[PDB]
Amino acid sequence: AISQERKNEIIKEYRVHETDTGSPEVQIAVLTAEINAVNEHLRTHKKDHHSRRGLLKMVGRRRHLLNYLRSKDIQRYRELIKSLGIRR
RNA sequence: CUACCCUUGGUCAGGUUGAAGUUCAGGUAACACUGAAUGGAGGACCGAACCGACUUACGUUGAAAAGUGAGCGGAUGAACU
RNA sequence: CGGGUCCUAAGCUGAGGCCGACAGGCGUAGGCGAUGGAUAACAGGUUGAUAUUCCUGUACCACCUAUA
RNA sequence: UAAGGAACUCGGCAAAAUGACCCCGUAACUUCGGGAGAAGGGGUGCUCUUAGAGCCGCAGUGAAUAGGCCCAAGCGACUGUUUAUCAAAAACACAGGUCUCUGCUAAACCGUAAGGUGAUGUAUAGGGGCUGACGCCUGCCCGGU
RNA sequence: UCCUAAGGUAGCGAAAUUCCUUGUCGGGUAAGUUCCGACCCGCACGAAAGGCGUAACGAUUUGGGCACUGUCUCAACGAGA
RNA sequence: UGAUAUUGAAAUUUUCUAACCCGCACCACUUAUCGUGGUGGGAGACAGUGUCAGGCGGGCAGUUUGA
RNA sequence: UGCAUUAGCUAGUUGGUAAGGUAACGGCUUACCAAGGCAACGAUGCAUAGCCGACCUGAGAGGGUGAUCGGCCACACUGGA
RNA sequence: GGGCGUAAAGCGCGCGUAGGCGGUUUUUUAAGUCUGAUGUGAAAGCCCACGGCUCAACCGUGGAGGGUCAUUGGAAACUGGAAAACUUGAGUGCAGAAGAGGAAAGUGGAAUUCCAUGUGUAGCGGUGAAAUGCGCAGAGAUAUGGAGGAACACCAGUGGCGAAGGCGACUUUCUGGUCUGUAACUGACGCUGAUGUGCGAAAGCGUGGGGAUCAAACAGGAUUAGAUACCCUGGUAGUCCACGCCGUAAACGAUGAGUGCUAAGUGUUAGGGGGCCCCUUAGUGCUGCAGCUAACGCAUUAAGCACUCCGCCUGGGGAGU
RNA sequence: CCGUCGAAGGUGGGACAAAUGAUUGGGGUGAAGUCGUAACAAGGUAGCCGUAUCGGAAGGUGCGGCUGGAUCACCUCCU
RNA sequence: GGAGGUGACACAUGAUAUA
RNA sequence: UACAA
Ligand SMILES: [K+]
Ligand SMILES: [K+]
Ligand SMILES: [K+]
Ligand SMILES: [Mg+2]
Ligand SMILES: [Mg+2]
Ligand SMILES: [Mg+2]
Ligand SMILES: [Mg+2]
Ligand SMILES: [Mg+2]
Ligand SMILES: [Mg+2]
Ligand SMILES: [Mg+2]
Ligand SMILES: [Mg+2]
Ligand SMILES: [Mg+2]
Ligand SMILES: [Mg+2]
Ligand SMILES: [Mg+2]
Ligand SMILES: [Mg+2]
Ligand SMILES: [Mg+2]
Ligand SMILES: [Mg+2]
Ligand SMILES: [Mg+2]
Ligand SMILES: [Mg+2]
Ligand SMILES: [Mg+2]
Ligand SMILES: [Mg+2]
Ligand SMILES: [Mg+2]
Ligand SMILES: [Mg+2]
Ligand SMILES: [Mg+2]
Ligand SMILES: [Mg+2]
Ligand SMILES: [Mg+2]
Ligand SMILES: [Mg+2]
Ligand SMILES: [Mg+2]
Ligand SMILES: [Mg+2]
Ligand SMILES: [Mg+2]
Ligand SMILES: [Mg+2]
Ligand SMILES: [Mg+2]
Ligand SMILES: [Mg+2]
Ligand SMILES: [Mg+2]
Ligand SMILES: [Mg+2]
Ligand SMILES: [Mg+2]
Ligand SMILES: [Mg+2]
Ligand SMILES: [Mg+2]
Ligand SMILES: [Mg+2]
Ligand SMILES: [Mg+2]
Ligand SMILES: [Mg+2]
Ligand SMILES: [Mg+2]
Ligand SMILES: [Mg+2]
Ligand SMILES: [Mg+2]
Ligand SMILES: [Mg+2]
Ligand SMILES: [Mg+2]
Ligand SMILES: [Mg+2]
Ligand SMILES: [Mg+2]
Ligand SMILES: [Mg+2]
Ligand SMILES: [Mg+2]
Ligand SMILES: [Mg+2]
Ligand SMILES: [Mg+2]
Ligand SMILES: [Mg+2]
Ligand SMILES: [Mg+2]
Ligand SMILES: [Mg+2]
Ligand SMILES: [Mg+2]
Ligand SMILES: [Mg+2]
Ligand SMILES: [Mg+2]
Ligand SMILES: [Mg+2]
Ligand SMILES: [Mg+2]
């Protein structure tokens, strides 16, 4: 869905420190771009159920990371919520 | 006159109902979906004008060679003129 | 003022033209044809009988002639 | 108009009853729109205070005008149309269905023809036959015509 | 068994079709040749001269009930032409 | 539907063009979706039309359908 | 205690203020204000049932019963004071 | 104090909410847990002891028992609450690799059917045997060309991919997942999953296209005592496409998911490390111990040994009514 | 004496529940009367599952699936 | 040798218990 | 064998 160049752009922007690729903020931001791209694919490929199943897993993984971030530090969580186009 | 049509005009008191859309709100990953408001559709509803003629009474050397009285059907439409 | 001296609709008619025993039928250009388009005046007074028409006051339109 | 209340009659024909506005409340069935004004019930006068307190009559939309309602069955889906002048209907039409003809100077129709309609349209179009919303469906026979 | 091209599927049925006939049974009535629901013995239903149903609609046809009444028992009085 | 006339030219049904036809395009008459001519294109001795013939023909007509 | 083949219930309802009322607190009652309160941890509705010490059974864990004796409640032909 | 491969019993399969459950360590707390104190758990009853009834029933007296009870003082291992660390679980990054995973649009070869043309003549077709059927108006056969729909030989393999249903010509575009290595990173972020929400062979349904082959129904021909069949000749829906619906199958491994542990041998698929072999991951098969099983059998892909969560069963018929 | 609240009663339309109703549907049991012979063997067309359709009936046929299918082949695997 | 994949005319019927 | 037909 997204290139390694676009992924590295997102990692650079949302990392909480240098050499960070595994924080919730980095993962949620990358998952958000991937979810948006597959939604773009599914708008002209409505019958692609198999791809849509993979999108549903990304949405579930993002929601779990968001729940963990919210319960650990709500300040980091609410700043990430506005940065992306995410409600809750 | 009447039937149908052509061209060009005109007319339809007031009430009632509340379609599609839209917006806001919930809701979603994105749609579906839902409520409120808005909106004003319909050979839609009730009912004058108007157009009819279902029932009944009267009239039947008529007021009238087809009518009158009382109700009755349609009444933004395939309307009436 | 309404109509004509303006415009076209349906329709009618139709120089030439096409068709048809005859008589005639159709039709092109064009023409006629309002129920539509265009278009300059109002208020008051007056008679037995007319009135945006007569009369009074105040206008507007088209055309003509002269100064411009 | 006593008492009765459809016993009248082919048939409740005619008449009586209902009726306005405001507020409650409303069934089977349903194509989810409806059915529905379903049904069934409450309130209306006048005066005073700012919803209460009073006043009067037999009666308060005090006159006139203003849906009767319910249950079930046949037919037709529906609005519409018809025998001017004894029939308005279950008849006609209808949206929908199907069959069939028609390649365009189309087929079909009027006309002797010319000229036209079809159509200033072109098979998602035009003419003709039958059926008649919608739902579920539409079996057998091609010997004869 | 005979014959045919083939001998009526689903659904419906005393029906706007049933002659016998007021068929028979049930419901409704005190009493119902009409009505409703069933049966099938369909004189002589039957699938686009469509079959079976169907919410909504009807001055349609048919049966029942409430309200209501001079329709009636059974007529009487009054107003006017 | 056939013959024949309009109706010709070559092969063996095919070909051709020149009669006939075009509710085919452009041009002129001409401010004209008529018409008439001109040029292209299509079609073509077919079609259309005349005469003759056979067939179908309640679409329409005249009649009959006894005592 | 059953039943989800019972999922929505409530509008004095839930809270507040004031007054009234009671032996007493209290929506207990009324007036005004606000829109709360309950529920899948089963609200609500329907059905069933007086509850307990005890009693019967069982190795026990459990299952079954509430006559007699004792505690508590409710009722006194039905309903309202 | 039971089960769910074949006896009744694993939802067809995902995603996921509530809930249940949850890796290592330190500090802290004290709800659960443990341990005393106090109060209370009436009397009668039951049980033990003793006394009175001639005995016994029975009666009486003294004890014991019965709470998930409350209040209060201690303990701190485990469960829970708070705080702080951790990297093994789970994710991310980086480096490789394989794949009929999915959606869309294009290109191609064989064959079937139909159509035309040329040659060419008497049958072709079909069965157990036949007949229906097609054919002298030229079939069938043969050669060439065209139209059209459908499906993709060989490759092809207890091979591969996918949650399952499923996925097989080739090309491009869009896109999902998995595996191996590394140890940058985050630091338990996990597992399961009622309700829910989605996907789901074939048949079937709606609208509209398409229509080669095959083929319910149906017709004819056979067979047969009959033949509403099996066989033959045809043939409609359907089979194909798009968009909706339906939500079911012996949807099967008749075996729910997760995690760990427990002999070996031997094929195969995709990788990695080291010297064709040895080691090692992850799949996919066969054989086979321990163990399990009623037996059959299963056996590191468990039906073994364990913990967590879900679904389901409780004799047969009636009745999945 | 007047008004608000007030049981019972009456009026109305619905909700629910139990009884019964011409006729009607399927089931169980009893007996084997009748018609066939569908399954069990390759049960004489392998059977079963879903679905569709047809038929006196068991059942047939189509499409997909399963082996919980007999007999004989050609291959992978194991011993 | 044993498995797993692959492929490959007609024949109706026979009551109840007790066996 | 006792039955059934
Ligand atoms: K007019
Ligand atoms: K037509
Ligand atoms: K014929
Ligand atoms: Mg007027
Ligand atoms: Mg109307
Ligand atoms: Mg009206
Ligand atoms: Mg009229
Ligand atoms: Mg009148
Ligand atoms: Mg009306
Ligand atoms: Mg003329
Ligand atoms: Mg005058
Ligand atoms: Mg009277
Ligand atoms: Mg009276
Ligand atoms: Mg009365
Ligand atoms: Mg009478
Ligand atoms: Mg009488
Ligand atoms: Mg009347
Ligand atoms: Mg009124
Ligand atoms: Mg009608
Ligand atoms: Mg009408
Ligand atoms: Mg008349
Ligand atoms: Mg009349
Ligand atoms: Mg008709
Ligand atoms: Mg014939
Ligand atoms: Mg008769
Ligand atoms: Mg008929
Ligand atoms: Mg027919
Ligand atoms: Mg017919
Ligand atoms: Mg009809
Ligand atoms: Mg009346
Ligand atoms: Mg008089
Ligand atoms: Mg005649
Ligand atoms: Mg004559
Ligand atoms: Mg005579
Ligand atoms: Mg009781
Ligand atoms: Mg026991
Ligand atoms: Mg057991
Ligand atoms: Mg299990
Ligand atoms: Mg079994
Ligand atoms: Mg089983
Ligand atoms: Mg399973
Ligand atoms: Mg299943
Ligand atoms: Mg004693
Ligand atoms: Mg990579
Ligand atoms: Mg991979
Ligand atoms: Mg899970
Ligand atoms: Mg579930
Ligand atoms: Mg299908
Ligand atoms: Mg066949
Ligand atoms: Mg289809
Ligand atoms: Mg589809
Ligand atoms: Mg199962
Ligand atoms: Mg397991
Ligand atoms: Mg395990
Ligand atoms: Mg083994
Ligand atoms: Mg292995
Ligand atoms: Mg058999
Ligand atoms: Mg068999
Ligand atoms: Mg069959
Ligand atoms: Mg399968």
Curated annotation (Swiss-Prot):
An annotated Gene Ontology molecular function? rRNA binding
Pfam families registered for this protein in UniProt: Ribosomal_S15
Record flagged with keyword Ligase: no
Looking at the keywords, is Ribonucleoprotein present?
yes
Q: What SUPFAM superfamilies is this protein classified in?
A: S15/NS1 RNA-binding domain
What GO biological process term is on the record, naming one? Answer: translation
| CDD domains recorded | Ribosomal_S15p_S13e
Q: Which SMART domains match?
A: Ribosomal_S15
Superkingdom of source: Bacteria
Provide the Gene Ontology terms for cellular component: cytosolic small ribosomal subunit
Q: Which Gene3D superfamilies match?
A: 6.10.250.3130, S15/NS1, RNA-binding
Keywords carried by this UniProt record? Ribonucleoprotein, Ribosomal protein, RNA-binding, rRNA-binding
Q: Which PROSITE patterns match?
A: RIBOSOMAL_S15 (PS00362)
Q: How does it assemble?
A: Part of the 30S ribosomal subunit. Forms a bridge to the 50S subunit in the 70S ribosome, contacting the 23S rRNA.
What task does this protein carry out? One of the primary rRNA binding proteins, it binds directly to 16S rRNA where it helps nucleate assembly of the platform of the 30S subunit by binding and bridging several RNA helices of the 16S rRNA. Forms an intersubunit bridge (bridge B4) with the 23S rRNA of the 50S subunit in the ribosome.
Q: Which family does the similarity line name?
A: Belongs to the universal ribosomal protein uS15 family.
What protein name does the entry list? Small ribosomal subunit protein uS15
Organism per entry: Staphylococcus aureus (strain USA300)
